[PDB]
Write a protein that binds this ligand. Structure first.
Ligand SMILES: C=C1[C@H](O)CC(=C/C=C2\CCC[C@]3(C)[C@@H]([C@H](C)CCCC(=O)c4ccc(O)cc4)CC[C@@H]23)C[C@H]1O
Lengths: 10, 239
């Protein structure tokens, strides 16, 4: 459920 | 002995940290200005610094050997729970015992008890946060030890919501063993005395700091006007 954290982790 | 794989691990973590931690603090100029005068006056500035510090912590995390083998869900769980702890840990670098403050290069960017208080946080967090910073400063860690501690904090298998705990443990153990062995070969006494155990104790102090941070975050957040002054990344990561 974490759009931004996911984007920065990719 | 300290193995080439372990020497490699240290190398990676030092560079990873150098790329994610600017000791000149040049980016602080992008943050909403600090206001010390005025309730919650410091909140926009510190919310922004935390937001930034979150991104930089993620940047460090991605570069930890074995972190990339984890599921995205687990990467996410580990970052969510450790972010504030790693921010507390990395902040030791700017913290100074000279006057018990975080000194980020200029008086506008030097922060103290009253400034954190002006960010909506009480002494329940701040008194033990500063204690934590003094106790960690007193360890006078090698930079090598500093980067390993931050990485071990991030890869913890007991964080709630952790799926592949066995794999998380295997990564952390590799970093733990790297740290034990480094202290023995590279840290001369008496600085090395019980140093591993003292570092581990700091991971326990951080859990408690994290718990308190969460309660106060939740209280401040109940009011939507405060939450308005935070950043989207901070809302996503802290809740
Ligand atoms: C680059 C770095 C580090 O990443 C971060 C640095 C310092 C960090 C500090 C020192 C000053 C005070 C800091 C920022 C702590 C504050 C408690 C954070 C306060 C702002 C905040 O996060 C918040 C405010 C309101 C709310 O509803 C929810 C959250 C958290 C960690 C504390 C300086 C510097 O060495």
């Amino acid at each position: 459920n974490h759009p931004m954290l996911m984007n920065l982790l990719k | 002995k300290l193995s080439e794989e372990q020497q490699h691990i240290i190398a990676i973590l030092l560079d990873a940290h150098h790329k994610t931690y600017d000791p000149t603090y040049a980016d602080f100029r992008d943050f909403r200005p600090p206001v010390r005068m005025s309730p919650l006056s410091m909140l926009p500035h510190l919310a922004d610094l935390v937001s930034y510090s979150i991104q930089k912590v993620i940047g460090f995390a991605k570069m930890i050997p074995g972190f990339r083998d984890l599921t995205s869900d687990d990467q996410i769980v580990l970052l969510k729970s450790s972010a504030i702890e790693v921010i507390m840990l990395r902040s030791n670098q700017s913290f100074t015992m000279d006057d018990m403050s975080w000194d980020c290069g200029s008086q506008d960017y030097k922060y103290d008890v009253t400034d954190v208080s002006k960010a909506g946080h009480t002494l329940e967090l701040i008194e033990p946060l500063i204690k934590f910073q003094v106790g960690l400063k007193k360890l006078n860690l090698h930079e090598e030890e500093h980067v390993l501690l931050m990485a071990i904090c991030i890869v913890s298998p007991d964080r709630p919501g952790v799926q592949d705990a066995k794999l998380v443990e295997a990564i952390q153990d590799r970093l733990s063993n790297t740290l034990q062995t480094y202290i023995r070969c590279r840290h001369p006494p008496p600085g090395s005395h019980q140093l591993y155990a003292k570092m581990i104790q700091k991971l326990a102090d951080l859990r408690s700091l994290n718990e308190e941070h969460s309660k106060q975050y939740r209280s401040l957040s109940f009011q939507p006007e405060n939450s308005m002054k935070l950043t989207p990344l901070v809302l996503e990561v802290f809740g």
